[PDB]
């Protein structure tokens, strides 16, 4: 009966909210300018609140609706995504800044698989979800391996829920961009055991994550999935506090990865330009940092640039504009996931 | 400050707040209520409030109107999906609940959201594989059980509305069911996947596919043992239609059967009781060891479980019929679930 979100040829959107009871009803959404450009909608005679906003560039937007000042989903949208605790409504505008972010119809899908693990380091068993490629099943090839890694307040959970990677993955892959590829999203915060919208808190620290990882999450793969291994068959990445563990599991462990992903983050020493020269002597084959002009962790990204370039040790950076943002992150793993497991 | 809602008291009272000075009206719907709505009543700093109970032990799902708007509790991080219709749940700790927790000194089996080619359908289609804890890392074989949703469900729905990982986890951790793979799939042949995250895509189809799409696939590429006696389905409303075509048109091909709130089957009305009778007939004598019949008392459906019991009866044919409380909800499924599985493979 009320369609909401109705996407228009022009890119234009319209959102519906029923009730004749409420004054006000506003959405928050993510073309909007900041919190200062929240949007009001127009209440009509039959109790029926609506907005057209647009054209919106192609992209996949969040939003939500606040009535009479408590926040409120669209009903009418099945699309919803949570990112931690906070549950919004989204859509995806279709155009070629977006297209990989669709689930297509017409593109065979890779599984994802919610696995528990004991770990040694932590002390107790925990869940991270694994991307297997299309076509996994039934065959016997093996693959290579990329670690994909969240920022705080995020689970094993975001990077196929917020950052569309299921979706990104299939896309990439089947359309000959990436090579197919086992792509694994852990917790990364060592006190929990899971995401918390599933996973209540442990009955009961400092670099226990990424030790973990190498102990722990790295052989339960290579034991349990048809991994190739060896460093030019692993890839690590992470955003923000990710990021920070990409570095430091990648400078405790040189030669364990070859592709290396730095995103929306900067710097953390005798011991760090050691380790710098070890990992430069390591035969990586990318070091890879990309972040938003517009992020506050910008020039301690330049930093982490510097600090490279201190040791004639070469990456290769991607600055894009905006900020600190999981519309970067998707962009971020859309970019990279194709350098992954090539050479040149 | 830091809103707690909902707030589950030592005396399983529960109470719910939302935040506005700028609201005037917030109710609450919830399944405790019979049929119901309960007002939320305003302080003088913008807080509503209600509280609610005691509550017998059990999860419920809830939801707030604002203003004449359906609101969900943003302080609460437990939301579930059935279809369309998202609510946020919570559940009261107790004996009739436990089963339904995801706790953290039990050891969890995995899910698996796994896409296969159909050819009965003519596309690729999604299902929910549940391994049992361990399943990774060994080489045991382990029995399946086939668990398929009704009308407007999903594969997603039977972990998502049903609580199947974590009745599975406990019920395995606790020596109470046998370590079994769960195979839940969509059951509506027009779908590849669950509509919150596949698109629409450009009759007896589910039925069949099961049989020769499913089952193949689950057997080559998870660790299954294999045969009627290593095998189980069952269903619920629409799915226990589906059950009883399945299990009728295959005879021999599952030992454990479970049909959840229905009853008969839907060619003149005496052509079609022939064939029915010669499938009960050729069900009956193919070694099945258990034909389970679950439905609640005051279910639309009752009628036609009695007919169904009735029929069978008249076939000497065997069934433990087991009737509950209530009606058609997922509550009730739960249970059936909860009963169902550690009957299974024994």
């Given at each position: 009966r009320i369609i909401s979100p109705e996407i228009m040829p022009d890119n234009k959107v319209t959102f519906r909210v029923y009730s004749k009871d409420a004054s006000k009803v506003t ?86 698989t919610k696995v528990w693990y004991k770990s040694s380091v932590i002390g107790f068993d925990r869940r991270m979800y694994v991307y297997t490629p299309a076509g996994y099943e039934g ?31 299939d896309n990439l892959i089947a359309q000959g961009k990436a090579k197919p590829m086992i792509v694994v999203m852990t917790n990364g915060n060592a006190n929990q055991a899971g995401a ?149």
């Amino acid at each position: 009966r009320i369609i909401s979100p109705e996407i228009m040829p022009d890119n234009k959107v319209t959102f519906r909210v029923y009730s004749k009871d409420a004054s006000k009803v506003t959405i928050t959404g993510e073309w909007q300018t900041g919190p200062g450009g929240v949007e009001e909608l127009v209440k009509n005679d039959t109790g029926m609140f609506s907005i057209t906003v647009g054209p919106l560039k192609p992209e996949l937007y969040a939003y939500n609706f606040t009535v009479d000042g408590v926040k409120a989903l669209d009903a009418n949208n099945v699309q919803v995504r949570r990112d931690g605790t906070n549950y919004q409504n989204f859509f995806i505008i279709p155009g070629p800044e977006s297209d990989l972010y669709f689930h297509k119809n017409n593109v065979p899908h890779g599984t994802v698989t919610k696995v528990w693990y004991k770990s040694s380091v932590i002390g107790f068993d925990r869940r991270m979800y694994v991307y297997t490629p299309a076509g996994y099943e039934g065959d016997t090839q093996r693959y290579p391996v990329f670690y994909l890694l969240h920022g705080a307040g995020g689970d094993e959970d975001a990077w196929t829920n917020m950052g569309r990677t299921a979706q990104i993955m299939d896309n990439l892959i089947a359309q000959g961009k990436a090579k197919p590829m086992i792509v694994v999203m852990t917790n990364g915060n060592a006190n929990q055991a899971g995401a918390q919208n599933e996973v209540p808190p442990v009955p009961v620290m400092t670099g226990k994550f990424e030790e973990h990882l190498v102990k722990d999450v790295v052989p339960f793969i290579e034991k349990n999935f048809r991994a190739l291994t060896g460093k030019d068959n692993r890839a690590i990445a992470g955003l923000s506090m990710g990021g920070g563990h990409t570095q430091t599991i990648t400078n405790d462990n040189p030669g364990m990865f070859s592709y290396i992903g730095v995103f929306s983050m900067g710097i953390m020493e005798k011991e760090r330009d050691a380790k710098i020269e070890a990992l430069k002597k390591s035969g990586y084959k990318l070091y890879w940092i990309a972040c938003g002009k517009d992020d506050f962790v910008y020039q301690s990204a330049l930093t982490l640039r510097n600090t490279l370039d201190k040791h004639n040790f070469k990456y290769v950076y991607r600055e894009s504009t905006g900020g600190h943002t999981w519309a970067n992150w998707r962009i971020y793993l859309s970019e990279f996931a194709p350098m992954l497991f090539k050479l040149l």
